[PDB]
Design goal:
The structure is a homodimer of 273-residue chains. Chain A has helices at 2-15, 43-48, 55-72, 79-99, 107-112, 122-130, 144-154, 189-194, 197-201, 241-249, 263-272; strands spanning 20-24, 34-35, 38-39, 136-143, 161-166, 168-170, 176-179, 208-213, 230-237, 254-257. Chain A has 273 residues and is of the alpha/beta class. The first copy, chain A, folds into 2 domains: 1-31 and 117-273, 3-Layer(aba) Sandwich (Rossmann fold), CATH 3.40.50; 32-116, DNA polymerase, domain 1 (Orthogonal Bundle), CATH 1.10.150. In chain A, strands 5-4-1-8-9-10 form a 6-stranded parallel beta sheet. The first copy, chain A, has a two-stranded antiparallel ribbon with strand order 2-3. Chain A is globular and about 55 Å long. The interface between A and B is medium-sized, with 26 and 26 residues. Chains A, B: It is found in: Cytoplasm. Chains A, B: CMP binds at residue 72. Chains A, B: Keywords: Cytoplasm, Disease variant, Endoplasmic reticulum, Hydrolase, Magnesium, Metal-binding, Nucleotide metabolism, Nucleotide-binding, Phosphoprotein, Transferase.
Chain lengths: 273, 273
């Protein structure tokens, strides 16, 4: 309902800066799905395609993706069933990334020479948020170290920005040995939300939330919010559109089909802050 | 291969206007997939959503689409298996369109008040083609009468443009009674190509072809070309991208991901004509 969306937004404007927080996915949400007719990379792709991975290993990674992607988007399987494969997919990809002995010191170059792109309007998004000290919480199934190099290098890793993702584990050599903590993946966002309760409890007054995601899963990202008064959910639908449009209109308050900007979010921010 | 693509294009430039013809799909190929965050309509949607269809019938049409779309994009079914359902899908939708008794005289309004959009660069595409009398052959699984009202009203139904689609059959009242000829649908483009042999035989000298499509099926659109010397195949990949990207890079010479313009085609035309 367009009426309901306005009731929410009016709540947000009434709250102003003092009551607002942002929860958002990263890949295909803050970064672009495609550009100039070309598919843009996800954090995983940045590494898969970089010069520190061999042709042979890149080929094994692609086979993984073709097998496991097809299960991810299987119409017959429940998420129950899909869950162990999503887990398998990450353990193997990660498995292969370990073997290449990726050097921490190389991340900065890897990201700098990749095709990665933030959506139109991102400086304005991030700056406007920093200038009002609005807490921003980025919850991604991607790779924390890459994610951070994208935003650092774009000049928008401000102090209000908290990043929570799958971070790389290095050894003494400063060479990748695995992944820290519990795996974030598309199917368990809810567990990841409640696993970050300590951050959210420090934000009790921030009871007006804008959530930005790109999948159905992302709808759970606010499951650990302490005090919810008003929440606006904005959904980027970049792929599997005809299949998922109804479901998205059904659950996100705003569905933006193949939209490579943050202009809708920026105009809503303009009214609040 | 980028080298191979250039060999082809060089053939096309050498041929110039005198040897060129264009074969192209319409929906999501000349028309837009989405706009300003909103999914644009196909020729079928224009009718489904117009004021001459009831709320109730529009609801039955949507159920059809949700059932039959899911079969169309089933990974397990062969096209063999899917083929009778695609046929069923059209017969029922058409079936329901008949019942509403759609008036021929109303098409002009229906199209004029719909959200339909051609890609950026379309006037330049169509004009440049008309000005060199380049035969253009539009082969669509949509609805001929709608397709024609979109292009007529956009001021680009020029005499070099031949339209071949599923055209509406009216009765004495000028009220829809069915569909003429054999059904064009996504799976039988090849049969439709050879069924239009008479048009292609009149174009024997036009042995340089540019083909524009949006599906795998569309690759068969040139199957009835009399004399093939050079052919460039341009593919719009608007949906199911991650699933289909490899297959598309595999078979179209140029794959343009979520690209709502004709700029690539227009620059290739600039070099040829």
């Amino acid at each position: 309902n367009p009426t309901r969306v306005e009731e929410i937004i009016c709540g947000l404007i009434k709250g102003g800066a003092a009551k607002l927080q942002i929860i958002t996915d990263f890949d295909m949400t803050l970064s672009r799905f495609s550009y100039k007719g070309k598919r843009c990379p996800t954090c995983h792709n940045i590494i898969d395609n970089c010069k520190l991975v061999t042709d042979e290993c890149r080929k094994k990674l692609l086979q993984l993706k073709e097998k496991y992607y097809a299960i991810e988007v299987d119409p017959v399987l429940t998420v129950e069933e899909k869950y162990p494969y999503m887990v398998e997919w990450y353990t193997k990809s990660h498995g292969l990334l370990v073997q290449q002995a990726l050097p921490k010191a190389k991340l900065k170059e890897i990201v700098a020479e990749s095709d990665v792109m933030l959506k139109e309007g991102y400086e304005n998004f991030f700056d406007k948020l920093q200038q009002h000290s609005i807490p921003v919480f980025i919850f991604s199934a991607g790779i924390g170290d890459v994610l951070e190099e994208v935003i650092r290098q774009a000049g928008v890793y401000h102090p209000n920005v908290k990043v929570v993702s799958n971070f790389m584990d290095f050894d003494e050599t400063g060479v990748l040995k695995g992944f820290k903590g519990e795996l974030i993946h598309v199917f368990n966002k809810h567990d990841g939300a409640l696993r970050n309760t300590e951050y959210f409890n420090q934000l009790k007054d921030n009871s007006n939330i804008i959530l930005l995601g790109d999948s159905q899963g992302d709808l759970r990202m606010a499951d650990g919010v302490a005090n919810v008064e008003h929440i606006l959910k904005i959904g980027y639908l970049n792929d599997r559109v005809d299949e998922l449009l109804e479901k998205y209109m059904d659950s996100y308050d705003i569905v933006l089909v193949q939209d490579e900007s943050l202009e809708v979010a920026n105009s809503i921010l303009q009214k609040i802050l």
